[model samples]
Target: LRQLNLNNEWTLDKLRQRLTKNAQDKLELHLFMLSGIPDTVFDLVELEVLKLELIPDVTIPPSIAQLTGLKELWLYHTAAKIEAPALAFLRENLRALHIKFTDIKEIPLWIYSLKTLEELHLTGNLSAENNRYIVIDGLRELKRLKVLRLKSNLSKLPQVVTDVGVHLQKLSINNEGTKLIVLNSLKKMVNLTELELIRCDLERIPHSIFSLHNLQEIDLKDNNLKTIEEIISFQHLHRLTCLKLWYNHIAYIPIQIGNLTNLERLYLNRNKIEKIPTQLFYCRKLRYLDLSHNNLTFLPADIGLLQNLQNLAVTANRIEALPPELFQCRKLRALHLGNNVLQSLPSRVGELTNLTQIELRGNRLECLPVELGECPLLKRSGLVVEEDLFSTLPPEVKERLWRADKE
Candidate 1:
């Protein structure tokens, strides 16, 4: 698991010295504005992962075959050319491939011939001028492929994806703010466990997603969705655990959210939500909940029901007061309540012995409760508050907090 990262400051002498000393299995060569990879890189026969970023006109020579253990390769924003011998070796050995290009045509055809590839990520302009669809073929040849990600300006899900739908367990598409008009082919991917469709400008959750009985996580961030009333349909996905719908225009969350009994993480930040339904507390398994940067005036008192809760964020909201019940979640660790109108905090905060990070800046609080000093893990460094409010604590409390920081 040893790794070496050689950035722009790398030199041939330094490279050889470091390689000889470390014998790293993973090598990341980030040549910012640089042109070529050092020829000596191919000599590392034990190299299993190689990442090259921002290098122009990269050519994988026949010597690449020497790295027989190489299983993963990443080329970021590099117009790479792989020779026949290098391609042949990669097709037989590589298990994961990542390519980020500026134009769709820069995607090499050799990628489709990688019979052993289990994960593939392609990010770039996937559509041509005049709204023409770029052709991507031969995905059906990847029998072992389980993860496929495409981040581009696509107007719809590519047809080639459905060609290997039955075998894929994870599928992600970042449409780069394009208005994706069709996802009809997605229903064919019944085995998908994780799905992300970011910045797709979707006005609603795709009906096709509800048919995915095996889905465990779904992220539809940065979309145009104004309503998520369709979320009630998720009751059928018994295994769902994580749901992210941040950066949308959602104004309401239906009470049916409580139906997701297995959910552990829920992110609904950066929306226009004004209130949280009390029924949402029914998801007792939730460990991480984020509702920051929203229009929430107060959290439901039922939040105390989430005994499993660990991290809770409600920053940049209009909350005016804290419910004493919130402190009942003794397992709580990080609490972010900055940029609110709260004038006082509940003294029961001392009960959360596991609390480590608490943010209270950008609020109208005249002082912080000395009870916060009772939490053994509340170090001064993790306490984000105005100096005046911090000074309000007793000298003994301040000393204890500072001592925690020293540890």
Candidate 2:
């Protein structure tokens, strides 16, 4: 076949030779007249995963039913239906399907026929707000569906979701505005363990979210959230491990936040937060904490209560000094205290034997603690100590101060 140069023009003979038996096959068409699958390619009855990227106005013929073993199907930027003999035949056997479009109003009805689908991902403009034209009630038929991700506006969340919602473990919905009205559909989804509402214009954590005690991870980043009133409940969410409240106007954290005892990672950066509630130190299990780009002036004296904390980032704040108590967190690996009015650090910083990457760039300091050289990791990978006006420092410290020329 190589000698004939017919590899590019696989009329019928070449396809039958190359696609004899397949586990997974990819077929992409750039500019072609045919809008259907080549008949010879269908002979591979063993094909399990079929990926098709077609041009405009294409149709997957009914012959696709020959591959009854097909378990996964992916269609990218194409217009086609998997209904009837074409895809409907695999309803009971298919496990995963992905459709990525440029501008789709709603889910294609053909997707509903796959009763055994465990994962379904649909991505596009997602402007399906008209309930009269497109109803997600078809999704009610997928009883085994566990994951559904859609990017669009819902006229009204289909009640079908509630019927199958009990089995779902992950659901993500993204829309244009800040106020999403889909919580009504989320009421019965008590089994969801992960939920993300990326750009749905949320200004506040709705009461319905507090009811999701089963959620382990929740991302409410990129919203207009200004306040999570002290009256709101955080006690029900004992299982939450990661809470992201970045990119908002939040000024203060309520004391009730101390209830998430299992939290290991917390992100409160890029907000207008001015104060840190001392009660937050109750989360002793926390390992990663970021409070950068805020208006914070100081941390509580008991900040050392988080003995297991490894990464602490409080960069770009109005902080003037560190509590001597900070050195008590000996498990810290990376510390970010740059761009602040800090005049000095405790000499015990050397006791943080785990210190590897320390960012002390852009601060007012008169001397570098000689004890800092005791940290093997910091000494091996020398980082900026007190960037300016250092005289009592050794020549080794001077050699690593590459940016000190400006000072």
Candidate 3:
């Protein structure tokens, strides 16, 4: 049901027990906890999903290759001392794999022979498990591995580069949490579109990473990245949209961030930024901007020009006052001001009629506008009449107003 997906939930023993309990003639079997399921029972097997994960249970029967109607297989956590035989039965029908957490040191010799693997996720500690399970010569058999994500302590990715075809769409080699060396395989992902490197100890964000014309999103999040010059310094990043550099040490955004006209989401949360760059206002398509957890003192006054901007989050900053232009935005939907050093919203907040949810809980709001006390639209399903400001208020509205302006 996922990808590197996020977390593995199946184990070997769990697979066999579930299959034993729920194998129906017409129904598709997606049970993943079967540990000791043999190969022969797959003669009439039609599985939609087969998952065998985390805990190692050895010696699976070769007859598993007989499951010709299978769609997905996750064989990640393995402790089997012997080799997993050639599973030709479920090879061509397979679509995705979540097999990085295994104790198996080497790439299984038989797995490389599968011709239809589309997405492969690799993670966990592959260096400590010193066994030769991978047969580089046969890797060519995986003609459909379009997306490969490796988050391991392994020394290097697959060495045979010439064997990789253009079918690969996305690739990420992140030891973001550990020490990663030899990032040479990334160059092979020429047809790739999206890439991310988290907490990786890389020397720099290389220029070649940008040359991949198809690249639309790049996440250099949570690393020791200081300055991104030529990498993001371009006149027109026509395809690039999502740029996530959150939790990084970089304070100033490269001026090139302005060139991306199609950029909709810019996540710079938890950074060293002191203020929002004025250049960001040039991004005509900018919709969601998250500058949360930063040292921002103010946002660009021209931020009103982001006519399409729907979601704006600027929590935890020193924005003591709201610019009049902010209330002028009629399209703004959700606004977050939590933990900011502010006192009150603009008295013109009544003009922001489109605003459905506003976070005024963590501000220094001692009182709300008297005009808010009279807005009939906020209390009932009708247009707000300005003159209805204070007289016919409900008990709840009166209580909140009284609390705002203490006795």
Measured by lDDT, the strongest candidate is 1
TM-score, cand. 2 vs. native: 0.71
Model 1: per-residue Cα lDDT over 1-407, one tens digit each? 01123223455556544432224435543334546765566665655667777876577777878877677777778777788888788878788889888776466666776777888988888676754553566676777889888777776666777777778888887776577777466676688888887887667667777777887777878775665677677776676678877767776777788777788887766778876678867778787767777788778877777888767776887777777667666667777777767776666664556675766677677776666555556666766655567778788778767877786
lDDT computed for candidate 1 = 0.71
The 0-to-1 C-alpha lDDT of every candidate, in the order given, reads 0.71, 0.63, 0.58
In model 3, which runs have C-alpha deviations exceeding 4 angstroms?
1-49, 58-70, 79-86, 102-107, 128-137, 154-158, 178-189, 347-361, 368-407
Which runs in model 1 stand beyond 4 Å of their true positions? 1-12, 16-27, 45-49, 130-134, 371-376, 394-396, 403-406
Candidate 3 lDDT over residue span 189-252, tens digit each: 5687877777777636655554567878777678655566743554434567777777776666
**Worst 10 contiguous positions by lDDT, candidate 1:** 1-10
Least lDDT summed over 10 consecutive residues: which range in candidate 2?
Answer: 26-35
Tens digits of lDDT, candidate 2, 1-407: 33124224445555434433333354322223334555444445655566655434445566667755567666656776554766656666667787767555323557776677887977665444344424555665666888888664544465666686888988887775535666544665688898887766656566676667788887777775666763246676666778776666776766666666677776666778777678767667787777667787787766687878767766788777777777666677777777666766666665666675666777666566665433234552445555464456766554444323323
The predicted structure with the larger TM-score, 1 or 3, is 1
Model 3: worst 10 consecutive residues (lDDT sum)? 379-388
lDDT of residue 218 for candidate 2: 78
